[PDB]
Write a protein that binds this ligand. Structure first.
Ligand SMILES: OCCc1ccccc1
Ligand SMILES: OCCc1ccccc1
Ligand SMILES: [Cl-]
Ligand SMILES: [Cl-]
Ligand SMILES: [Cl-]
Ligand code: NA
Length: 129
């Protein structure tokens, strides 16, 4: 599923991401935009052989199991294919764990490079929330 901007902000809000660990909703939406273009089905292979999955491009190196990343962990205790559902719940819960590990949102390279220090509120401007 490809979410619309406002539609995803609303889902993220309902799932408890608004100001989660101090990151306002615009950060999550901006992250989602640049990681996946709001596509829940996004997969991208990394140079190391791991794969990033779903709307927030969660990596199999650490966070989920895809059966093909030798020596990786599954810290969110989920199959990576759960991160591809049209329902964002698992990507959200896994994101909460990631973002609480010490690096905050810097875990997402595109957030550091494209959203961090920008007016992220623009990403939720005009949405009914
Ligand atoms: O910003 C849209 C360009 C983009 C497409 C696919 C994945 C991330 C970004
Ligand atoms: O208005 C739509 C969302 C948006 C926010 C910031 C930059 C480009 C687009
Ligand atoms: Cl915001
Ligand atoms: Cl594996
Ligand atoms: Cl932080
Ligand atoms: Na893994």
């Amino acid at each position: 599923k490809v979410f619309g901007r406002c539609e995803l902000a609303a889902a993220m809000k309902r799932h408890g991401l608004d100001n989660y660990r101090g990151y306002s909703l615009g950060n999550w939406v901006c992250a989602a935009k640049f990681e996946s273009n709001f596509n829940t089905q996004a997969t991208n292979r990394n140079t190391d052989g791991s794969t990033d999955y779903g709307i927030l491009q969660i990596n199999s190196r650490w966070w989920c199991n895809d059966g093909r990343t030798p020596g990786s962990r599954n810290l969110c205790n989920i199959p990576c294919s759960a991160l591809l559902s049209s329902d964002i719940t698992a990507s959200v819960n896994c994101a909460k764990k990631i973002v609480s590990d010490g690096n905050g949102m810097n875990a997402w390279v595109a957030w550091r490079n494209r959203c961090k220090g920008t007016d992220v509120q623009a990403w939720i401007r005009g949405c009914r929330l």
